[PDB]
DNA sequence: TGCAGAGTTC
DNA sequence: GAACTCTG
């Protein structure tokens, strides 16, 4: 999820490209959204979609690095819990999804090791790991469809790459900073407004409305939201500019909770500058895996791999 | 599941 | 009249 409408905002700065443009590139990928998602009674669909993607990547000469979600933050859990209160046993559907995912994790990491692709378990948030990889110039981008990566400092992000009718879109920090006037702090304030995976937003704030807010109270860091907060705590009191529209909407009392901006500003990530390695993928083991989990033979997989191994050489 | 247009309200 | 949402 992340910010509810941020992609709509940034689309003016994103450029449509083709998969042939990622040829000379080393990019990070957040697999955690996939297993976060993944009635024909199929076996291991996470692995199925993962395999097809994994092919698509190497076909276009991408050098991937996969990033795995760790312990979700306190604010992420609080957000999903207060999002389920709106929509004894909640603690027993937590410990049954983790043992299913655990196996999904293990199988996916095995598939990766066979394909010769390295990977890193992010200690808490995975988007933050991909972001800090972008920042230290360890990757040359990050393939993800999650807006929240921007708030963790992202500079170059490739979106809609796997979405097949949608064209691959390349987004750059500098581009939408120079066009839209957005920095990391303004985007985090936008996260307070529009709603994100660490905090639900304001009921009626569309994109344009959140920008109207962030311009009505200019400032540095978190000042805009404090000014808007005390202004709405004042103007709500009764004498009964364009600020009337903003009077109308409802606001929470703890707004703004500074722990939210704190979580986006200083997240937890691996600090070391890893030097990464892509090994050669052994063929036989891959067909063995495919039969073990899907039930594919040797020339059922080879019909798919025939372009892939051809491009590898 | 993302965009694009209209419908409904201030 | 324009902007936001909902649905197609």
Numbering used by the authors: 1 to 38, 47 to 95, 752 to 904, 913 to 985
Lines from the paper:
Nucleotide excision repair (NER) is an essential pathway to remove bulky lesions affecting one strand of DNA. The XP complementation group G (XPG) endonuclease cleaves the damaged DNA strand on the 3′ side of the lesion coordinated with DNA re-synthesis. Here, we report four crystal structures of the human XPG nuclease domain (XPGn) in the absence and presence of DNA. The overall fold exhibits similarities to other flap endonucleases but XPG harbors a dynamic helical arch that is uniquely oriented and defines a gateway.
To characterize the interaction between XPG and DNA, we obtained crystals of XPGn in complex with a short splayed-arm DNA mimicking the 3′ side of the repair bubble. Crystals of the I422 space group contain one complex in the asymmetric unit, hereafter C1, while those belonging to space group P4212 contain two distinct complexes, termed C2a and C2b. In all cases, the arch helices are fully ordered and adopt the closed state, though α6 in C2b is halfway tilted towards the open state. In both C1 and C2a, DNA binds XPG with the minor groove facing α11 and α12b, while the major groove faces α1. In contrast, a straight B-DNA can be modeled on the C1 substrate with no clashes. Additionally, this peculiar orientation of the C1 substrate leads to partial DNA ordering in the vicinity of the active site, which allowed us to identify the damaged and undamaged DNA strands, as well as the putative scissile bond. As mentioned, the main contact involves the H2TH motif and the undamaged strand in the dsDNA region of the splayed-arm substrate. The phosphate group located seven nucleotides into dsDNA from the putative scissile bond forms a hydrogen bond with the sidechain of T873 in α11. Additionally, the damaged strand in C1 locates next to β-pin residues R823 and K830, which likely play a role in the interaction with the ss/dsDNA junction. Moreover, the DNA molecule in our C1 structure is tilted by ∼15° away from the active site, as compared to other human flap nucleases.
